[PDB]
Amino acid sequence: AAQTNAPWGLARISSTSPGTSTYYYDESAGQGSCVYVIDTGIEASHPEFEGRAQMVKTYYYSSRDGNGHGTHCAGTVGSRTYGVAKKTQLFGVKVLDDNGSGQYSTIIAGMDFVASDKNNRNCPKGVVASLSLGGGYSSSVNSAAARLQSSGVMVAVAAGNNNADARNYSPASEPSVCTVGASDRYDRRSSFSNYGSVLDIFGPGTDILSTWIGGSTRSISGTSMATPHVAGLAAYLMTLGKTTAASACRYIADTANKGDLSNIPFGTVNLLAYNNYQA
């Protein structure tokens, strides 16, 4: 399948070269998979989600996304126009308030929620969780991410936006999950992207168009935007049967575009997520 005039990041993930604008992908499109977006919520009524999104948990007075960040990330996972895996099921877990903040204890509870809640959902092709959040190093936060991964969920986490080594941030620094840095449309490391040996992969993160609250759209930047490209890619590849939740990060690294990014510090992987789809 071909989506013309796609957002640059979608085109990038199906291309061996920057500078194109059509996204190519297998029509299975993540059908039968599920992606949890652990964030500020999801505006599930947005026409872009086509009834495939729903809120399953909140720790606050509402499950609605009063911020936009979670809706934007969910759109990159699975919206019809802005999403990688256009037929996946999206489940929102609101661990962040409408200012985008959340206590680590709430975030940990949300991860353990997903590890159990997947047993209440129909996801025959597998389960992914996208975590566009983080703060300073915490062994408890890393352990919660490790448990979620161990339970059979492909965990993708943002590297962070500090232009610093991600070893000092959580859950970015947890070895067993997939830690995602950000790149721009010219294949440069995004100016804010964290780096370091703990990164597994880069995805598009600068000037990413996606859904927003109020039934709208906007372009924003962050490792928060790169993470859902990788989460959606995992769901898509799991639906194709090419990999599993336990092996998808490694498979994405195996099949990535290699050596094509600029300003990658010595010791950080030079790997850009790629779907290897042959139309």
CATH architecture: 3-Layer(aba) Sandwich
Fill in the CATH topology.
Rossmann fold
Can you write the helix and strand succession as a string? EHEEEHEHEEHEEEEEEHHEE
Figure out the total of helices. 6
CATH class: Alpha Beta
Q: Characterize the main sheet.
A: 7 strands, parallel
Measured by DSSP, the beta-strand proportion falls in 15-25%
Strand order of the largest sheet: 4-5-3-6-8-10-11
Sheet/helix structural class: alpha/beta
Shape: globular
Counting copies of identical and different chains, the oligomeric state is: monomer
Number of domains: 1
CATH-assigned homologous superfamily: Peptidase S8/S53 domain
- Share of residues in helices: 10-25%
Rg calculated over all Cα atoms? 16 Å
What is the terminal separation in angstroms?
Answer: 7 Å
* Beta strand count: 15
Binding site for Ca(2+) 2: 16, 260
Catalytic activity: Hydrolysis of keratin, and of other proteins with subtilisin-like specificity. Hydrolyzes peptide amides
Keywords: Calcium, Disulfide bond, Hydrolase, Metal-binding, Protease, Serine protease, Signal, Zymogen
Function: Hydrolyzes keratin at aromatic and hydrophobic residues.
Written description of the protein model:
With 279 residues, the protein is α/β, with parallel strands linked by helices. The chain is 24% helix and 23% strand. It has helices spanning 8-13, 69-78, 104-117, 139-150, 223-239, 248-254; strands spanning 2-3, 23-24, 33-39, 53-58, 89-94, 126-131, 135-136, 153-158, 169-170, 178-183, 201-204, 208-212, 216-220, 257-258, 271-272. Helix 2 (69-78) links the parallel strand 4 and strand 5 (89-94). It is globular and about 45 Å long. The chain starts with a strand and ends in a 7-residue tail after the last strand.
